[PDB]
Design a binder for these strands. Structure first.
Length: 86
DNA sequence: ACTTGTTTACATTTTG
DNA sequence: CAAAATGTAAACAAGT
């Protein structure tokens, strides 16, 4: 098991991201590629990821431009919590 | 059928 | 000795 908190994995997925933002499935793919450990039991840890993403205010939800209206929004970091490293 | 998102509830962990 | 951070499970609502 990798030694990172779920909040750290989301943060790390968003920073390595191009646009410094990520859809949900972007976070998932980053975590699943980077660590094959999270290839097993996706349902449980992806619930923990949604729980952390919703509950932690350091993460901010960014919709599409104007009316993009896609399946989810993007996710980004807060310009105050990004000082905290992983 | 599912994905996404919010929230509650409870268990575990980690140091003043 | 709670407390705060964190993990896990789960019920539930809104959405081409």
């Amino acid at each position: 098991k990798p030694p990172y908190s779920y909040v750290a994995l989301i943060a790390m997925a968003i920073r390595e991201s191009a646009e410094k933002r990520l859809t949900l499935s972007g976070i998932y793919q980053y975590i699943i590629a980077k660590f094959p450990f999270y290839e097993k039991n996706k349902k449980g840890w992806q619930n923990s990821i949604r729980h952390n993403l919703s509950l932690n205010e350091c993460f901010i939800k960014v919709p599409r431009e104007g009316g993009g209206e896609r399946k989810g929004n993007y996710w980004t970091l807060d310009p105050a919590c990004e000082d905290m490293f992983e």
